[PDB]
Amino acid sequence: GAFPWPLSGKTETALREQAAELLSVVTEHPEPGLGDVGYSLATGRAAMEHRAVVVADDRDSFVAGLTALAAGVPAANVVQGAADCKGKVAFVFPGQGSHWQGMARELSESSPVFRRKLAECAAATAPYVDWSLLGVLRGDPDAPALDRDDVIQLALFAMMVSLAELWRSCGVEPAAVVGHSQGEIAAAHVAGALSLTDAVRIIAARCDAVSALTGKGGMLAIALPESAVVKRIAGLPELTVAAVNGPGSTVVSGEPSALERLQTELTAENVQTRRVGIDYASHSPQIAQVQGRLLDRLGEVGSEPAEIAFYSTVTGERTDTGRLDADYWYQNLRQPVRFQQTVARMADQGYRFFVEVSPHPLLTAGIQETLEAADAGGVVVGSLRRGEGGSRRWLTSLAECQVRGLPVNWEQVFLNTG
């Protein structure tokens, strides 16, 4: 839990503002209200080209940050920035692996917006599942445990869609969405292409189909450019490139034993790997043994043209929502995800502010390396982290954006943040 105290001005002027602030907040008993201060700092005092945001929950900790701002030193609880970044806004929606117990538990208390979309998502899922999504999202011991795909995929969907809604209600409005694997479904929902129910149905379908492939496959993320990985797996047809998450980030789908040996090899060559939290070989040839159950259970899928842009990690280009028939959805699940390629395009197209709506950052590095490999720096923030899913981590994400020039609706920020 935390409170955002926004401060702004040209250089030195900030140092001043904080200094003056310490004249009243520290005491001037009546000691000023912590939330009452932030709202003022935000409502009053405009917003200039040298910015900073003191994220904390106790008067002591604020004073610390203010003290440091005035002195012209860095502090942890203070996010500083230049506000010199003018590019387009995108929401990134990654896959599984973001999940953790009660991702939703904190932010649900603090934010009405978040809790609402979570409720919507739950209603949507009710007809298709024999368990309580809200219970999972809250960590009810008597509920499923994010150890099964249906539970994971539906929970992550809820989370991402709900974190997206928060970002928006607080004034961060996406000019485009880019999704990765199952994230495309959430991306769609958010762009207006898919409906809550249709998205949910697509997730339930996907999960039925793959139930066969369960434990027969997995995925491994590898800190090597595609080239290297390709050259390591050329003679290994039971492993396949599943994603190019960046110029030095690559995922591989295949049989367990294979993955294990490759990881062994790669751990020995001091290449950093991490096995992915997926129990099947998504974006691999094994996804074709289930094209039927899916294309059958999915049936008709209604996609609508979208108010937001939708860059497909399938194609690698802005796609017309409404072309997202059941085929697109079997393709989503069967095709390498070409993330780097999609982002590279979005960048050349202006997008330079990328927000990852995610219970934990999965693609933040890749976005950065890609943008920095196109001499096109931008702002790349996540939302929550594992074990850190309340206001402080979120407000920090928002802050890192604001400091770099993103507009914001503090009113709504303050509300949902409390």
Side-chain angles (χ1 to χ4, degrees):
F3 277 117
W5 282 9
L7 300 120
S8 65
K10 191 71 179 180
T11 49
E12 302 95 28
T13 79
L15 319 185
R16 304 187 204 182
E17 179 164 8
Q18 299 91 42
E21 192 71 21
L22 287 166
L23 299 187
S24 57
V25 291
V26 296
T27 314
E28 189 50 58
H29 245 303
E31 280 187 357
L34 207 175
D36 307 60
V37 168
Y39 191 56
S40 318
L41 284 174
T43 58
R45 187 81 190 192
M48 327 287 185
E49 199 230 357
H50 295 85
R51 312 191 177 178
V53 184
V54 181
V55 191
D57 57 340
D58 53 306
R59 198 175 309 273
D60 305 334
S61 52
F62 279 96
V63 171
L66 286 184
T67 292
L69 257 57
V73 319
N77 60 345
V78 174
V79 171
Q80 286 157 64
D84 53 13
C85 186
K86 266 180 176 178
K88 305 157 82 184
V89 174
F91 287 9
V92 184
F93 300 77
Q96 326 189 351
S98 341
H99 54 304
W100 47 281
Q101 185 150 338
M103 307 160 273
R105 185 146 191 137
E106 300 302 323
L107 212 46
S108 78
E109 317 206 300
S110 90
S111 159
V113 168
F114 188 76
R115 169 172 13 104
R116 288 168 190 176
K117 273 227 77 62
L118 279 191
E120 298 188 20
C121 287
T125 64
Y128 297 79
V129 298
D130 277 321
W131 44 260
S132 174
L133 184 70
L134 281 206
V136 172
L137 281 175
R138 291 194 66 76
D140 182 0
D142 298 356
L146 305 156
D147 46 0
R148 298 162 42 181
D149 304 303
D150 40 355
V151 188
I152 298 170
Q153 295 199 17
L154 281 187
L156 282 175
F157 173 81
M159 285 295 303
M160 293 187 193
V161 156
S162 313
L163 286 165
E165 204 59 8
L166 182 65
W167 277 97
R168 294 180 81 154
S169 57
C170 296
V172 182
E173 187 63 12
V177 296
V178 58
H180 185 308
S181 318
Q182 58 174 75
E184 289 231 294
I185 304 180
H189 179 65
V190 164
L194 280 179
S195 60
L196 211 49
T197 315
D198 270 353
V200 166
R201 192 167 87 256
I202 300 174
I203 293 159
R206 277 165 92 278
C207 295
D208 288 16
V210 299
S211 67
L213 304 173
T214 286
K216 288 166 183 291
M219 304 180 74
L220 174 65
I222 302 173
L224 285 171
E226 188 165 21
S227 335
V229 178
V230 167
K231 310 307 161 67
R232 282 184 158 82
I233 66 186
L236 313 174
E238 54 291 316
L239 293 172
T240 304
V241 177
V244 189
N245 291 354
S249 331
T250 298
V251 194
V252 164
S253 195
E255 278 166 19
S257 48
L259 286 160
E260 179 102 342
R261 297 192 304 269
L262 182 51
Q263 197 166 9
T264 281
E265 157 192 335
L266 288 188
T267 65
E269 314 163 4
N270 308 303
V271 184
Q272 211 228 0
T273 77
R274 193 179 282 187
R275 196 67 89 81
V276 181
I278 187 72
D279 50 3
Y280 60 88
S282 183
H283 320 286
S284 91
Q286 310 190 3
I287 298 301
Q289 320 182 1
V290 297
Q291 187 171 2
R293 315 165 56 182
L294 177 73
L295 283 198
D296 157 60
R297 288 155 205 180
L298 205 42
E300 178 71 14
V301 175
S303 37
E304 313 298 342
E307 66 231 42
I308 327 179
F310 183 99
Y311 291 78
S312 171
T313 53
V314 175
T315 83
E317 294 136 14
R318 270 176 174 176
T319 46
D320 172 34
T321 67
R323 294 284 315 282
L324 272 48
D325 45 358
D327 279 329
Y328 181 94
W329 294 124
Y330 163 89
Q331 287 298 103
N332 178 91
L333 173 72
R334 169 56 180 88
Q335 299 293 331
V337 317
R338 328 194 75 171
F339 187 67
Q340 180 187 355
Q341 182 198 310
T342 306
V343 169
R345 174 174 150 100
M346 292 178 90
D348 305 357
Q349 285 233 60
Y351 294 99
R352 285 220 210 178
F353 279 84
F354 297 71
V355 171
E356 175 180 327
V357 287
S358 66
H360 187 78
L362 298 192
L363 288 164
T364 272
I367 300 165
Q368 305 211 46
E369 296 192 0
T370 306
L371 288 187
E372 85 186 3
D375 51 66
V379 185
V380 181
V381 313
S383 298
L384 311 181
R385 291 188 65 95
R386 301 188 191 93
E388 316 182 335
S391 300
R392 176 184 296 263
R393 180 49 65 185
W394 187 71
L395 282 175
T396 313
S397 315
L398 190 63
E400 295 179 344
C401 282
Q402 154 82 189
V403 304
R404 309 281 302 95
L406 206 66
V408 175
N409 182 11
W410 293 101
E411 180 196 38
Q412 287 285 1
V413 167
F414 279 88
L415 204 305
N416 300 349
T417 66

